[PDB]
Amino acid sequence: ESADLRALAKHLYDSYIKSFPLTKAKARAILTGKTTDKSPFVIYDMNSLMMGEDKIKFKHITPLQEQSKEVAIRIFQGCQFRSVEAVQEITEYAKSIPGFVNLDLNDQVTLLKYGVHEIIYTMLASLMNKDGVLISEGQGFMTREFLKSLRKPFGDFMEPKFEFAVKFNALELDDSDLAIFIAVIILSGDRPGLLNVKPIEDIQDNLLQALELQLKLNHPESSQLFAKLLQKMTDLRQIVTEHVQLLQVIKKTETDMSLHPLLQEIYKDL
């Protein structure tokens, strides 16, 4: 028991509670369980929109205008930022696994490259809202009516995330069991273009244990509860393929160009 039981748990959540604090306890907290009991720095209202596109943005004066950085490029970059960030966050927490870093420099990334997805989206759903999504910043969230309110395309890169959560949230226990989950998805164990699927999928056998472990303990009922709770990937791996379907149909057939290299790279592999 103890072994990795409460050890790993404290770990998974440890390195995690360090990487991304945004959890169901923080998402469902500010969403209503906190923030003076009102709502998480809502992002969409002039007030927020201002302190947002101004703050979160800031320093953005150039010979643009006319037809540049549309309501998307701004939101798209932000509504997507949480992604480009996680990647940086996951690691901070991923490298926590006593096997991840033991894997391979590329392998580790490779998995994430195609893992971080099922990761950010793993808990994301939780950090979602009916018409918004918990966003780091001053502890708020990006509403749908907002993100959507713009480029037909870029104007729909969350509604599908949150929505899925509304159906996924029915599989998210405590950030604890979740914190691990992200790992159960981090260790690739189902990512194309892997390197050491031996150590990767192996490091998972652990993260998985903790999952159903502190999970089958914090809520012991049924069998392979996790085996059926993980299968959720569907809606998970789904959103992913979607997140691209948009950035893919655009990155390959944008509305009329409006991106930079920092992007072309992100999408690109390695």
From Swiss-Prot:
GO terms for molecular function: alpha-actinin binding; arachidonate binding; chromatin binding; DNA binding; DNA binding domain binding; DNA-binding transcription activator activity, RNA polymerase II-specific; DNA-binding transcription factor activity; DNA-binding transcription factor activity, RNA polymerase II-specific. A motif (9aaTAD) lies at residues 261-269. GO terms for biological process: BMP signaling pathway; cell differentiation; cell fate commitment; cell maturation; cellular response to hypoxia; cellular response to insulin stimulus; cellular response to low-density lipoprotein particle stimulus; epithelial cell differentiation. Rosiglitazone binds at residues 80-83, 117, 243, 267. The keyword tRNA-binding does not apply. PDPK1 activates its transcriptional activity independently of its kinase activity. Belongs to the nuclear hormone receptor family. NR1 subfamily. Interacts with FOXO1 (acetylated form). Heterodimer with other nuclear receptors, such as RXRA. The heterodimer with the retinoic acid receptor RXRA is called adipocyte-specific transcription factor ARF6. Interacts with NCOA6 coactivator, leading to a strong increase in transcription of target genes. Interacts with coactivator PPARBP, leading to a mild increase in transcription of target genes. Interacts with NOCA7 in a ligand-inducible manner. Interacts with NCOA1 and NCOA2 LXXLL motifs. Interacts with ASXL1, ASXL2, DNTTIP2, FAM120B, MAP2K1/MEK1, NR0B2, PDPK1, PRDM16, PRMT2 and TGFB1I1. Nuclear receptor that binds peroxisome proliferators such as hypolipidemic drugs and fatty acids. Once activated by a ligand, the nuclear receptor binds to DNA specific PPAR response elements (PPRE) and modulates the transcription of its target genes, such as acyl-CoA oxidase. It therefore controls the peroxisomal beta-oxidation pathway of fatty acids. Key regulator of adipocyte differentiation and glucose homeostasis. ARF6 acts as a key regulator of the tissue-specific adipocyte P2 (aP2) enhancer. This is Peroxisome proliferator-activated receptor gamma. The gene is PPARG.
